[model samples]
Target chain A: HMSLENVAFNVVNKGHFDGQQGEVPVSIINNTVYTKVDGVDVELFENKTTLPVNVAFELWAKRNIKPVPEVKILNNLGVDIAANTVIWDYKRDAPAHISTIGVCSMTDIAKKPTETICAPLTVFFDGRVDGQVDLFRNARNGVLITEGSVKGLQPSVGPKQASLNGVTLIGEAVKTQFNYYKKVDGVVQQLPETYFTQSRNLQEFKPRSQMEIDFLELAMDEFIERYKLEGYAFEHIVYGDFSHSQLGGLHLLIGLAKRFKESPFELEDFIPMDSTVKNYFITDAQTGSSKCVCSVIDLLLDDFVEIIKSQDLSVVSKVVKVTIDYTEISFMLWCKDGHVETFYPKL
Target chain B: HMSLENVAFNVVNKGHFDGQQGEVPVSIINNTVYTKVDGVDVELFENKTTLPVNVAFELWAKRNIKPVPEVKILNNLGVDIAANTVIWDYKRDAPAHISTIGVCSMTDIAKKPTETICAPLTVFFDGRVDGQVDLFRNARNGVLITEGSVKGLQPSVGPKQASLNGVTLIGEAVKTQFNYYKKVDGVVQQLPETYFTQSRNLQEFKPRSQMEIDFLELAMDEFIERYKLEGYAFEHIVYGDFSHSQLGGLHLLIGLAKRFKESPFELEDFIPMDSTVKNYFITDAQTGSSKCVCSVIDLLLDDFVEIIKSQDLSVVSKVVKVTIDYTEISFMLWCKDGHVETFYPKL
Candidate 1:
């Protein structure tokens, strides 16, 4: 059984005066037609079905035609293959992000503006940017779009968090699959022929660096300072019980009451609103209640004296050290020997 | 002069199949043709000179016409007039803002729709709302409108600051002769006829109260908290020559230096950047400096000891209490008695 014309493609420039003169058809079974350049099969799509016409023209011109079509074939011709047009599928595929626009001559056939999306376009490898790619905006205009993944670049936790389209490409080398598609009846369908799945040993997964965060802080540092003058600070102050989906049965007053439990002074009958200490009485696990304000301060003084004791010794040895990080919501204490304590103010 | 038909107004509905038949023209000289309801002249524009027949119809029908010209004269009809129906003028003259749109029967005249300015309108006085005066939205629909002013009712300023034409009525009782005119050829000429310039002693004026300022603060307080996050504060820290506008020649650092000068311990060669007080010192009016972290603290300790001494004695005697309010821009110190000092961060 011999099949002569079970065609793989039909390429024609729809804008031409003579349509059939440039229709290039090629069929290569078992992938015999593609040629490799540095181990990358430039025309890698070997699927027999759904091979669009203009894409087949490129493959035929590059592989089968005697004198390959001039470079202007991509730049000048108004090839009517529906695959020639596109919309950015940035949600799935990464494309070059060239900021420049292309200028075209009045007669350029590719000047049929419906093909190029007015966006920065680029190519990706396993969701990693391979390199900058040229966008043929028109016959006279073009731009170079580069890698533009700034999403997973949060620097708060160092450099350990990043991804693209839910794929973990970080710290990995990947092959380029610069797939291009065009919209047909509201669906972006891919042309099933040519120039895909090539590993140039380029394109690596790299997250945005700390410089992004630094630039942000630099821009807004003065803005943040403006509000600081009026006895207020920007702080992520949140407190709640971790047990529930959201903190239930918790409030500021209740939280502050719990903090008193660890204090050196214990309260048997104490209220936050009581201005004088004489009316408030503290009962510790080891001591009984009823304390004057002087008594409560005397107890608190013990803890203060201990830190001072270390300071006094530091005068002689230069080794004693204490550190405190205090925000309105939380407080932390650190000693030279790694002794640590934490506290929170709650209702 | 018993002259009659040379008058300019021959009010007849121009959408007529016939000519000049039901043209009701009334000439009532010397303002006696008007009737009043309460203090308002309901038919005040009734005069002989330049009396538009449409307006005269209103006064004549209301005051002297038989059975009110079939009453349907203002009920339903498209009566067109070379008198060209009319537009409302809400002043002493019938320039047209005819609050009353007369629905006429098919036989009644004066319905050239071009003269009507379709708008809902109002006015005020004495910082109190008397009531809604009529507005002449259509010459066909007659609504008597008077002055409206609503300056006194400033609701608590919350996230809303909201206005209209730029005429302001301050706290003086004045009659507003809100006039109207029509664009004829290139000029907006005023109609020359009736009701205007009568003051009812109704309008009054009052300035925005202290409650207005309170409302502004309440509104912005919620807005400022929206940008606040953990560990950050907005402080508009400034310094130097406050005489120009507000900044009184000061900076936070310089202000602190002045504070230190008044303190018991003199800082010689004191540098603000030192994390500890040891190596920094200060000079006096003559010129002196010091260096050493411990020496700095030692000096500061003396000041602290003095405050503690006062506190210690205060337990026995209810005297010598102090309060301090410190922010980036200003520091305020208040003693229990009369010692108060405030420092601004300015240079």
Candidate 2:
């Protein structure tokens, strides 16, 4: 493989433009674990059109969304920030292809969203190792799930959608059961929208599989790709259950997640799974899954150090937590309607 | 974005490394497509490595997979011609963590298999929009499907254990019924392994909806970047049990395949859907999708005219067969044993 050095040298240099104008964001807080892109913390790169612009960066970002996105001002930055970005002018880009090349690579000059959640997410390829675009379009086309509309509407539905609160669940269950939909000529058949949502044949995804937990990170990734974080903060949980189907001898349920200050798709990486807790698992494999054990470090004021924090330190554990476990990827599904598609266990 | 006029200028004048000396057994074919290593045919640029030699031609086998892979070889030379080529032992690269002085480009080449079955194939990615690496990997990891083995190994069982074939398939079909797979979480779900060799699934993959066909093309474009096929032959097919599913979908399959001499994948594509033929469909969508009567062209060859040389110009009907249809994509799940595990559906 070509080294990152090649990437860095090839993409960044004096040839990009006038090499002025845009500024990089700085982390102001002492011992900060995460950095934000707020205006106060950001200084523009100044020379309007810097040379040696990152062609690769622009190429990647410009495809599905912006072609010529404006360079923005960034002043604030933080970890576990909000996903309230105002990057689109639905009116101006009306009925357009919606994806472009301009806005890629360059950082915000403040016109960008205050926050767009970023967390380590992983995507699992069940039994298949390769793929194409359908894996993506299924959600866009509302494949097995029901929705009021398929095209991009104002109230875009994603992994999380629901009637403002309580009754609806988004991570209750998600997956196709063996008998629910039979395979024809070897292909697992998919049911119509109404039939799929109502099928008792629906098998639950494994929330306990290490791979599935890793999948949770990916779900967060995909959801955030299309929908900017909006409205009330939400929490998302994905657990999967499988029975000797895809992986042959492998049979297990998986749970993977991150606890957060918000909704079905908030960005955080802490998990509170304990035997005493409702969603916790008992097996050591379930807890570790060869995944790195979550650890916390303090980045508070430099001069002030609490002796207790230095010693046995149990109470000072006020830090936030998250996980990129390899289980429960879609162990549970948070549909566009926010209803828990499937998250319960089976005997 | 900075203009590539300079990049191209410098590349043409000051070329990069040439391929390593090795044996190539296959004959070169026409219309090969590849990602522009330096945005111009490597053939146009003389070897700028330890040897300052310029061969009459660059490697020309097959071309881009799809999604507008950045470069087009144009095959300045036609097909069915033979040429001696080199197979660089990329592992032997000296400047391992490669750094570029000005601009640098390198194509990763697949090893010539000791086994004769897959010898004719080489590898390359389709292309990246505006040409970037992350963009290449994103589409690459998930979209383009390669055959044989990503990890080569001897079989713990009977034959060789690991394998990958470099081919992808795409066809058109609807959502619910088009292709029968789902997204449990963010990761794209792979079809069950049993389904891979199932004669039924093989039969059902042909004839997909038009949109599915387009997606297949899109995925191939990405794979080209990771694999980079600028001068290679490319073909496609569609398959399915159209009659029973009441709906037929598409499957995009690709690989580094045999040229016209003995394109194994092509033979697989031409595999008769005998058992499934009774199922082709009531009326193809095109017939129902269109109103005006338009016949597809089926032009004849000069050889046909030669056979009837006795006929005079007046007797000649000036026949020009029309064709609105394409050679539909086909699928053949040959060599059923261990190859099944090799069929990954998503990145």
Candidate 3:
């Protein structure tokens, strides 16, 4: 019974152990599991370590034996083939426990005669491995199975089916993929093949100009300050490069929330205009309910100021109350002649 | 019969006439008929001269006799009372020919014992007056009806009825009037009386700032050039001061048209934003039909340029055709892979 805690502790200690006193040298750092095999250290997994720990223990146990059907695991693209291939087995021949453990071999094609590429799948459960049983059945004819198609795998995540049909996966699964589909009348359809080829030939990314960067930074800083004052806690703001058959651009995804009311709204895409704020929520402290008010205060302030100046109402009137609705803003003013008048200024 | 040509020539000649050789020395310049009475020249009418010429001739005919019922006409506000009141008669006692004429006395209350202020009314026909028979009417017991309440007078115009109830008319009628009525659910209602007094005290007009003027001029110049290219003929642009109980501002009214297709669209009010052109028309040269496409070219140009830059399609694609509709703009592009694709950029 190799428990998860025992396995994690052993791996961490092995990396610090001196002079081959331990079974093997392994370590975990930054959610990635690393190990020294054939006197050189190589990364076993990236972004996760729970499932990788089980796979590593299984690989170390069978190190001396000839890998049954001799399949190599190419986990890291940057690491040399000899170092990455230290852990090996065919996907079908791997232990049944690997399916329950949550890891997926992302590639079907073997770079060499007996090798497959694997990645730790980030399991998005509800909303959303490894080797070795070599010598058990010598009399049975064994099928040499690589990772093959991942379509049938349950409790796993992949790109949208429509995206996969029009796009060719390039580089590694960890890298970004290109989808050659566009929305027509709200239905996603594959674009012409030539469009995909033309788009693929273009540069993957373009750096933002200094002016654009300055504007973005200034806008973000200003918005953050205002957002916090409006009772929203800022989580993060990220920019992602995106492209389609007809157009391509960088998308700003903002994450924010009101404290302890509900789950934080994550990756909310926004396109800012001079007059508006997009996809923002304000939680009612009393009701704990949220409402979205997309108009920014600065724009309304400027409009109100212009109305005041244009009306020549500076000396004779003062605003008594203001009401902001979805489509319009209304102001109640107490005029110099002891009467109140309501005004709806255009946005 | 005093001919219009003889009267116009006499009025023009009267201004330059060295002495009192001419009868009463009346002259016309810049559409206004000026007459010298009691050794001083005063404006008899402003902005038009046809009706004023007849009125001036009638006044000259009756110059020797004392005005019946002691009625006096104050035509010009700045001129002395003796000069402005050179021509006068009660409204009903005026000659029948004066009914066909287009002049309206704008004031109802008497400044003195028997006096009325008059203005030339620009008659809007289908969509839309002076004195001499007073001696005969005196024997028939003539009623003293100075331009009393313009409401009952047919083929003439006055302010809205709703505007009159809550507003107190002040100063000369030629100056702007203060209206204390507002639109509520499409029905006009008079505001509180105090609001009228407070609003009337405010300054009537404020000049645009230098920066605002610069922006207006630049925007107008740019719009004019593009408007001509789109087959519109420029007419005139005018700004007017307007106020209501709730708000007041200077309004820009643009007049323009397509040549020979239809009547020029006059006084089209527009509010410009960065993204759009408003109330603009493009005439079909062949069919002589006009359609309004309000998205401006420069805004579309910048949007298209941004799309190109963000997609990194500068070297690989060329725009084939552009289609501009009322609500959106579309572009067809020929890409490096020889496939044409259509794109609609957001405005």
The C-alpha lDDT values of all candidates are: 0.23, 0.20, 0.26
- Candidate 3: where are CA atoms >4 Å away? A1-347, B1-53, B56-211, B217-347
TM-score of chain A of 3: 0.20
Docking class of 1: incorrect
For every candidate, how close is chain A to the native chain A in TM-score? 0.17, 0.17, 0.20
How far off is residue B142 in model 2, in Å?
28
Candidate 3 has which clashing residue pairs, if any?
A: B11-B26, B11-B27, B11-B28, B101-B129
Q: Fnat of the models, one by one? A: 0.00, 0.00, 0.00
Per-residue CA lDDT of candidate 3, range A1-347, in tens? Answer: 23333443333332111122324356555444545432223443333223454454443322211111112111111112221122232232232122321122321123221222322221111100133112101102111122232222221111211111112122122122212112222222332222011111011211123432333345545644643322111111122111222111111212121111234322222432111123333443433443333212322222232343344233344443332211223333333443212222222
Candidate 2 CAPRI assessment class: incorrect
lDDT of 1 by residue, B234-282 (tens): 1211111212212221222322333333332233221111111122222
TM-score, cand. 2: 0.16
Interface RMSD of each: 37.5, 23.0, 39.1
Instruction: Give TM per candidate.
Output: 0.15, 0.16, 0.14
Ranking 1 against 3 by TM-score, winner = 1
